[PDB]
Amino acid sequence: VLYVGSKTKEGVVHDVTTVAAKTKEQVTNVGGAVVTGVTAVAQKTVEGAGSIAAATGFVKKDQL
Amino acid sequence: VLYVGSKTKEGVVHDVTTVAAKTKEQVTNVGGAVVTGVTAVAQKTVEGAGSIAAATGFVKKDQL
Amino acid sequence: VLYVGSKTKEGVVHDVTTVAAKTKEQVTNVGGAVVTGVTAVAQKTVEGAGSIAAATGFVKKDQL
């Protein structure tokens, strides 16, 4: 009766490897979003109306 | 009666490898989104109306 | 009756490795968001309406 229960991985980010030698960036930003990098987001549950989950480089401008 | 239960991987991101030598970027952004990088998003559940999940380089402008 | 219960990993970020040699950045930002770095976000639950979870490089300007 071994492992009668779970042995799982839910919403998992592992063994992410990155090797970026050079980024000679002249980044000019005027009222905007710029994303230059490793972004790991692991979630199990997100709920609600109008909800944003794991947004990267986002620009939200509502005339509401 | 081994492994009578689960041994699973649900919503998993693993063994992602990246090797980017050079990006001599002259990134000019005026009121917008730019994304230059590794983005790993692992989720199990997202719910709700009007919900955004795992958005990357997003621009939302509503006249509502 | 071994492991009758859980042995799990829920909302986990592990074994993230990054090697970035040089970023000779001339980052100019005027009223905006810039993100240059390792960002690991592990969550199990986020709830609510209008909620933002794990936002990176975000710009929110509402005319509401």
UniProtKB/Swiss-Prot annotation, chains A, B, C:
Outcome of swapping residue 10 to K: In PARK1 and DLB; significant increase in binding to negatively charged phospholipid liposomes; increases oligomerization
Modified residues (Phosphoserine): 51
Keyword list, A-Z: Acetylation, Alzheimer disease, Amyloid, Cell projection, Copper, Cytoplasm, Disease variant, Membrane, Metal-binding, Neurodegeneration, Nucleus, Parkinson disease, Parkinsonism, Phosphoprotein, Repeat, Secreted, Synapse, Ubl conjugation
Residues annotated for Cu cation binding in this entry: 14
Residue windows of the Sequence repeats: 6-20, 21-31
One GO cellular component term: postsynapse
Tissue expression remark: Highly expressed in presynaptic terminals in the central nervous system. Expressed principally in brain.
One BP term from GO: regulation of long-term neuronal synaptic plasticity
Outcome reported for the amino acid change (mutating residue 14 to Q): In PARK1; no effect on protein structure; no effect on phosphorylation of the protein; no effect on membrane- and lipid-binding; increases oligomerization; increases fibril formation; increases secretion of the protein; impairs copper-binding
Stretch list, region 4 X 11 AA tandem repeats of [EGS]-K-T-K-[EQ]-[GQ]-V-X(4): 1-31
Superkingdom per UniProt: Eukaryota
Compartments, as annotated in UniProt: Cytoplasm; Membrane; Nucleus; Synapse
One MF annotation (Gene Ontology) recorded for this entry: enzyme inhibitor activity
Processing and modification events after translation: Phosphorylated, predominantly on serine residues. Phosphorylation by CK1 appears to occur on residues distinct from the residue phosphorylated by other kinases.
Impact when changing residue 3 to F: No effect on osmotic stress-induced phosphorylation
The record's note on its domains: The 'non A-beta component of Alzheimer disease amyloid plaque' domain (NAC domain) is involved in fibrils formation. The middle hydrophobic region forms the core of the filaments. The C-terminus may regulate aggregation and determine the diameter of the filaments.
Quaternary assembly: Soluble monomer. Homotetramer. A dynamic intracellular population of tetramers and monomers coexists normally and the tetramer plays an essential role in maintaining homeostasis. Interacts with UCHL1. Interacts with phospholipase D and histones. Interacts (via N-terminus) with synphilin-1/SNCAIP; this interaction promotes formation of SNCA inclusions in the cytoplasm. Interacts with CALM1. Interacts with STXBP1; this interaction controls SNCA self-replicating aggregation. Interacts with SNARE components VAMP2 and SNAP25; these interactions allows SNARE complex assembly and integrity.
Function description: Neuronal protein that plays several roles in synaptic activity such as regulation of synaptic vesicle trafficking and subsequent neurotransmitter release. Participates as a monomer in synaptic vesicle exocytosis by enhancing vesicle priming, fusion and dilation of exocytotic fusion pores. Mechanistically, acts by increasing local Ca(2+) release from microdomains which is essential for the enhancement of ATP-induced exocytosis.
Record: disease: Genetic alterations of SNCA resulting in aberrant polymerization into fibrils, are associated with several neurodegenerative diseases (synucleinopathies). SNCA fibrillar aggregates represent the major non A-beta component of Alzheimer disease amyloid plaque, and a major component of Lewy body inclusions. They are also found within Lewy body (LB)-like intraneuronal inclusions, glial inclusions and axonal spheroids in neurodegeneration with brain iron accumulation type 1.
Family: Belongs to the synuclein family.
UniProt name for this protein: Alpha-synuclein
Organism: Homo sapiens (Human)
Gene: SNCA
Coverage span on the entire protein: 37 to 100 of 140
